[PDB]
Amino acid sequence: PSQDNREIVMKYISYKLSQRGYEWDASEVVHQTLRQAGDDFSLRYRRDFAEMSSQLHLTPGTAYASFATVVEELFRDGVNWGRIVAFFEFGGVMCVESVNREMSVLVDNIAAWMATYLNDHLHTWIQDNGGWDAFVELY
Amino acid sequence: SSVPSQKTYQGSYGFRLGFLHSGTAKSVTCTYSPALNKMFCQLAKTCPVQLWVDSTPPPGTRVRAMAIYKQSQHMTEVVRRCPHHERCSDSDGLAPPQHLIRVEGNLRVEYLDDRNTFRHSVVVPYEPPEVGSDCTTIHYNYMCNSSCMGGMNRRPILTIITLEDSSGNLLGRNSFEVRVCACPGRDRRTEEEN
Ligand SMILES: [Zn+2]
């Protein structure tokens, strides 16, 4: 069940990393509307993503807790589809920057971090708010 | 039961509002009349409102926005979006569909459906002006036309901007009228001489 959720993360990261020149190896109705929503958010909230990227000092020694701290503040006043999209986009944003800083190994860490936070905190809310089906019905 | 107050309160920080020098054109999506204290704009388009302050507020301050109807007979009624635009699919993912005012370009935006006043509000954390500038600019969005029948029905409204602290106590308040229209320039100059 969680596994399907790991697929959503890695498919998202492998798609955004792929529109750059970086090839990264770890139905489609929900992944493409999610990827399209993320491409929107990278332009709207570029200042917020840059600020989150500065509070998370991404080094090889960066732990999951330093990542969950920034993402937990994103969901401080409750979780919604808009902030879930920003969760996916911020994650995909960090890998894009780590590849650009000669740190390709950090992508697998960010991928794993997004998966655990997805299953432990966002999954319970996704199931009770119409599932990913409802996210397709709106966005 | 009570109506939100519109009384100006510059407070301990000299809280004043500002708006850009935009004229009455046709490619003008947003323009503010200093004479009428009234902003004219179109649906879902950027409305820059700058916050001017004489002494920087402390961290944890919040900037709220709330709409009320201007005429006294309609002040007791909540400003809501028309049923057409509530069921319309224009949600950005962060704003609930019933809200009229939105804030774009801020991930920390929060929308309050007040469980006692029934009145909608939008609140973002206050941030001091960017380095080099002298004011904090917030980009609002009005998701329903003033002409929109079934919602406002051509009733003019005011936007009340307040400064508040951690717990929501008042530190400053300012307001300005707003009209949501298709052609703001023609609708502004029409009202700019009557
Ligand atoms: Zn409407």
Author numbering:
A (entry chain B): 7 to 32, 90 to 202
B (entry chain A): 95 to 288
Paper passage:
The tumor suppressor protein p53 triggers transcription-independent apoptosis through direct interactions with BCL-2 family proteins, but the molecular mechanism is not well understood. However, anti-apoptotic BCL-2 proteins antagonize the activity of pro-apoptotic proteins by canonically binding to and sequestering the BH3 domain of pro-apoptotic proteins through a large hydrophobic pocket (called the BH3-binding pocket). In this study, we present three crystal structures of p53-DBD in complex with the anti-apoptotic protein BCL-2 at resolutions of 2.3–2.7 Å. The structures show that two loops of p53-DBD penetrate directly into the BH3-binding pocket of BCL-2.
However, we noted that a BCL-2 construct (BCL-2#3), featuring a shortened α1-α2 loop and certain surface residues replaced with a BCL-xL sequence, could be expressed in high yield and was suitable for crystallization. To improve the success of crystallization and to ensure that the linker does not affect protein interactions, we linked this BCL-2#3 construct to p53-DBD via three different glycine-rich linkers. In particular, crystals of the three BCL-2#3-linker-p53-DBD fusion proteins were successfully optimized for X-ray diffraction, and determined at resolutions of 2.3–2.7 Å in the P 21 21 21 space group. The RMSDs for superposition of these three structures are 0.2–0.5 Å. p53-DBD and BCL-2#3 had similar interaction modes in these three structures, indicating that the linkers did not affect the complex structure. Notably, the flexible loop and modified residues of BCL-2 are not located on the contact surface with p53-DBD. This indicates that the modifications of BCL-2 have minimal influence on the complex structure. Two loops of p53, the loop linking strands S5 and S6 (S5-S6 loop) and the large loop L2, insert into the BH3-binding pocket of BCL-2#3 which is composed of BH1-3 domains. Two hydrophobic residues of p53, Leu188 and Leu201, penetrate deeply into the hydrophobic pocket of BCL-2 and interact with BCL-2 residues Phe104, Tyr108, Phe112, Met115 and Leu137. In comparison, p53 utilizes two flexible loops to form core hydrophobic interactions with BCL-2 at the corresponding P2-P3 pockets, while polar interactions are formed around the core.
